[PDB]
Amino acid sequence: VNSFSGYLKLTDNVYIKNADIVEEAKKVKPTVVVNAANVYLKHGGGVAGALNKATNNAMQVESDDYIATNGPLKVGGSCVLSGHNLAKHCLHVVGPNVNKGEDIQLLKSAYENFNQHEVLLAPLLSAGIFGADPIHSLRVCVDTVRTNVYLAVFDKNLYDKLVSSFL
Ligand SMILES: O=C(Nc1ccc(C(=O)N[C@@H]2c3cccc(O)c3C[C@@H]2C(=O)O)cc1)NC1CC1
C-alpha cells in the first residue's frame, strides 16, 4: 500500500490521474518524481520548468553542476538527482522532442529508465511541448514500464481523452 490517492488503474502496474505533478509531488513526497528533461537539463518550460520553479531554482543549480561535471545526457537516457522539496529523488528522463526531429522510437528507451525504480510519480514522456502524441506515449508506457507508475496528466481534457481511448 502507498499514499497515491484518486488514481484510475489502467493495468496491473500503471495508474493515471488528472493532476498537477507539482502539487501531487508536494503532497505525496514520493521516493521518485520523474522530470521531462532535455539533454542539457535546462528546465525552461513544460513539466521541467514547473518542477524547477517549485524548487526555487535549486533543481537548475544542481543540474548545472551535474552537466559541468558529466556533459549532456543522451536522448532516451536519464540521471538521478535530488528531489529537493518535491521528492526524495528526481529521475530526469529525456524523451525525444518531436519539435527537434528526434526519433520517436527512442521513447521506449526513455521509459525503460523507469524500470530501475520500484515506484514513480511521472508525466507522460515526450508529451506536451515535446510534441509527441500523448496516446502513443501512454501506450509505450504501458508496454514498457513494469514497475509501479503513477501518471499525472495536467490537462483534464487530455486526461479524459487518454482514459476514453485507452485499450
Ligand atoms: O505549472 C505548474 N505545473 C505544470 C504541470 C505540467 C505542465 C506541462 O507542461 N504538462 C504537459 C502538457 C500540457 C498539455 C498537454 C499535454 O499532453 C501535456 C504533457 C505534459 C503533462 O501534462 O504531463 C506545466 C506546468 N504548477 C504551478 C502551479 C502552476
Please tell me the distance between residue 155's alpha carbon and the centre of ligand 1 in angstroms: 7
User: Rounded to whole angstroms, how far apart are CA atoms 75 and 109?
Assistant: 9
Angle between helices 58-70 and 46-54 (to 10 degrees): 120
Give the residue among 34, 40, 33, 30 at the shortest CA–CA distance from 60. Answer: 40
- Ligand 1 pocket residue status of 141, Cβ below 6 Å: no
- Please provide residue 28's backbone torsions phi and psi, each rounded to the nearest 5 degrees: -85, -35
For the beta carbon of residue 136, count every other beta carbon within 10 angstroms.
14
Task: Give the resolution in Å.
Answer: 1.0
- The correct answer on CATH 3.40.50.620 for the domain covering 8-165 is no
Q: How was this structure determined?
A: X-ray
Please tell me the distance between residue 22's alpha carbon and the centre of ligand 1 in angstroms: 9
User: Rounded to whole angstroms, how far apart are CA atoms 17 and 156?
Assistant: 9
CA distances (Å), 82 to each of 20, 35, 63, 66, 110, in order? 20, 11, 9, 11, 19
Q: Where are the domains of the chain?
A: 8-165
Give the residue among 107, 113, 119, 109 at the shortest CA–CA distance from 149. Answer: 119
